[PDB]
A paper describes a structure:
Four such XCC6012 molecules are intertwined into a stable tetramer via the heptad repeat α3 helices that form a parallel four-stranded coiled-coil. In contrast, the clipping treated with the xcc6012 knockout strain (XD62 #2 and XD62 #86) did not cause as much damage as that treated with the wild type strain.
In addition, XCC6012 contains only a partial c-di-GMP binding signature motif (SxxG) and a long sequence of 57 amino acids comprising two α-helices (α2 and α3) after the β1 strand. But unlike other regular four-stranded coiled-coils, XCC6012 is further surrounded by four additional α2 and α4 helices, forming an intricate 12-helix bundle architecture. In the surface of the coiled-coil, a pair of salt bridges between residue Lys77 at position g and residues Asp75 and Asp79 at position e and b, respectively, are observed, which stabilize the coiled-coil as are generally observed in other helix bundles. In addition, several hydrophobic residues are found to locate at positions c (Leu80), e (Leu82, Val89), or g (Leu84) that are normally occupied by hydrophilic residues and exposed to solvent. These altered hydrophobic residues are responsible for forming additional type II helical interactions. While wild type XCC6012 exhibited an unfolding temperature of 57.1°C, those of the K77D and D75K variants revealed unfolding temperature at 44.4C° and 53.9C°, which are substantially lower than those of the wild type by 12.7C° and 3.2C°, respectively.
Numbering used by the authors:
A (entry chain C): 0 to 55, 62 to 184
B (entry chain B): 4 to 54, 66 to 182
C (entry chain A): 4 to 56, 62 to 183
D (entry chain D): 2 to 54, 68 to 183
């Protein structure tokens, strides 16, 4: 906590993180000008489904035919995840500051404020799926060895916003948890 | 406008719901058509996922969503893709733009993507009624071969639902 | 088009349901294929989804919707598999629970072992693989014909194949 | 198997007083700082064990079988296969052949394909205990890092069934 990167874009850092849960973490992240995010519902579905399956009984209240079905789903899911890792290009690992409003992350190339595009993020880790969020560049600055971008997400809509808030809240208690 | 083959235009759309929309679609010549079951399953399934029980079932559903999402993306990122474009679609046939003209009577299959998030294509065997060009290019008038009870009921529901969505 | 191998045609098709149909099939000379379990799972599952094509509402609405998602996933994965698989040559074949007679691009001596490769359903890009040996290879006007005798199937697979063949027959008489 | 005499201390640490299965399967050790995931490993093992065993529902189950089979095929297209060799496996660690030898203390991940009909791999973080050669190949004695209650139980169940199955005829 207490990273000075915010001194590079005071007004932007305040817009994105003031008075709202903001998490500083490392995960595959990136920004691309030529969007192709998809829908709010896809992002929302990814986040919610991800929550229902994660964060660390069948013989009872349930038969056994359904346990097998659930087993098969776990297997299919793992295999489809394996398939994806085979072709998709992974995002680079980076330290980012993420809130419901936007994100501060490092980028190979600077981009003037006003540039529009999509923030790419791999939320999970065991699942090679990306969360894409349309966003605009609020600020762009360097610290000497990396170009930093402050991106503000375009309106997320009621459902996705909720899923994202829950997502951030969970990540936060867990980071504090394993401490 | 449409009246560059009024003969077919009337056969395909007169007195029946005919929607005008933009969706990837195309005509592919072949003697190897698809199946009615497959097309019916595709249509009804898209519709049943329009908009609970023990926790294990709720998480099974979450797992399904994740699988569908991942598999859907893989297809969409590696496919040929059909030509986006304005088409006129009814339970009887479709009015779409094709790269080249075709002699009427030419047998083949109309391939269209009924939904855009899901990259699964709908395959319907059809014959060309007319092939007049003018919109700088060649427009085709395709007549679906008899769909059969089930698939026809599915297609009408699809178009009706699709129309209200649009008319709102 | 069967006298080319009298005894072999009698061993594989005498006093037993034998169907004549066209589908992608081939014989692959391989050391060891295997897995009756995979072959049986395929045939039994196909049959259930084949019949799908008991009660409309019935169970919870959520369930019906999950089933739909399954139909979508299967279709999508099917499409993906076709984007890079190798289609097998379509051909007429005589198929019994004991063996199969098909057209091969080349001939093989009696005793050659491998797997009979078949695509059971046109809508599903999945292949059925059954270990088999060649007990007859002869030629007629042109094409090379092989008589493959399946290696023992085991209780389950046999039942699955017999069921599959019977339904195939029944549907065939439906013309 | 006399491979143990090549590294008595390690062989004893990994297989003494515990079920140890000698079998053939694709398995490898790769130097990496990939912490893997206990939850992923446990899910794989329990699910595997589950399948190693109203009409609408039965149809759904049929669809799952078909999907699983196809997805399996896809992965097997462009996936880097593991080396199939004889191994010695216990809940504590595993002895397997390796391309290069490694100094004891070297940490990485053991990769192996639990079932032969599915291309899904199990990853388990481990450290090299011993590393010796029999004149033909380099053998490694890897000690899995703590598995955690759940994963450990799943693995114990997995090895026990495996041992049972193989004691037939």
């Amino acid at each position: 906590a207490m990273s000075t990167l915010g001194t590079l874009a005071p007004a932007a850092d305040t817009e994105l993180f003031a008075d709202t849960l903001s998490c500083e973490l490392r995960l595959p992240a990136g920004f691309h000008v030529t969007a192709d995010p998809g829908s709010h519902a896809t992002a929302e579905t990814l986040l919610r489904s991800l929550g229902q399956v994660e964060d660390l009984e069948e013989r009872g209240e349930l038969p056994l035919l359904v346990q097998r079905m659930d087993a098969k789903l776990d297997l299919i899911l793992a295999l489809i995840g394996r398939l994806v890792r085979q072709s998709d290009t992974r995002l680079a690992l980076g330290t980012v500051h993420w809130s419901v409003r936007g994100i501060r992350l490092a980028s190979p190339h600077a981009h003037p404020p006003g540039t529009t595009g999509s923030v790419l993020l791999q939320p999970s880790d065991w699942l090679p799926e990306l969360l894409q969020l349309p966003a605009d560049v609020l600020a762009s600055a360097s610290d000497g060895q990396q170009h930093w971008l402050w991106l503000r997400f375009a309106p997320l809509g009621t459902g996705l916003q909720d899923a994202l808030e829950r997502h951030l809240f969970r990540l936060h208690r867990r980071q504090i948890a394993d401490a």
